[PDB]
């Protein structure tokens, strides 16, 4: 019924270019928060902080989308493993009771935007831009994704499909 899905602005990229991965939730009822683990290929790509215009550090938060923007103590978490190509981040409405009480649930929209800079010519066959998959601190999750509702419940992993990012190609 629900989905995690993504989209890019361009799939043909030259070295030096930036490709932005927008990550959406779709029909996640009363969505309150998410955490992702996202593996990328460190030979070809480097995560780029488009807000600070510099490389990620291990604490860098991706750009926001439209969800989780309300004043319900919206809080970020991030701890990457950049040497190994693993992004680990999430955001949540910490004040669940107030969010719940708003009677204005979110369920569909962009939750984050992760930009990669191409640092080596992309192979001719293409590469997957990134993959959602469990790192060591999401050992209990399915496909690198945890979603939650405004009761603070884990939104069950059989209620939604994670749609993996597709390929990028050299210009």
């Amino acid at each position: 019924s629900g989905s995690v899905l993504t989209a890019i602005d361009n799939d043909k990229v030259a070295v030096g270019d930036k490709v932005t991965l927008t990550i959406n939730v779709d029909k996640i009822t009363n969505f309150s928060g998410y955490q992702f683990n996202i593996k990328y290929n460190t030979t070809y790509l480097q995560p780029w902080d488009t807000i600070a215009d510099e490389a990620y550090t291990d604490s860098t938060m991706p750009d926001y989308g439209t969800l989780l923007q309300g004043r319900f103590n919206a809080t970020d978490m991030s701890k990457h493993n950049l040497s190994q190509g693993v992004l680990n981040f999430g955001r949540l409405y910490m004040n669940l009771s107030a969010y719940r009480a708003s009677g204005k649930p979110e369920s569909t929209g962009a939750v984050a935007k992760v930009t990669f800079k191409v640092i080596k010519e992309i192979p001719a066959e293409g590469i997957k831009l990134a993959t959602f998959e469990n790192g060591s601190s999401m050992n209990n999750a399915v496909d690198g994704t945890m979603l939650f509702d405004w009761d603070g419940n884990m939104y069950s992993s059989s209620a939604y499909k994670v749609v993996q990012p597709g390929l990028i190609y050299p210009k």
């Binding site: 978490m77 999430g90 949540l92 004040n95 601190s137 939650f148 884990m154």
Partner: peptide
């Protein structure tokens, strides 16, 4: 108590926020 610190733990703080 699962051995890892992730969002499921933060959601436990969350559930109690303002209590």
């Amino acid at each position: 108590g699962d051995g890892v610190i992730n969002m499921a733990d933060v959601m436990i703080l969350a559930q109690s926020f303002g209590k």
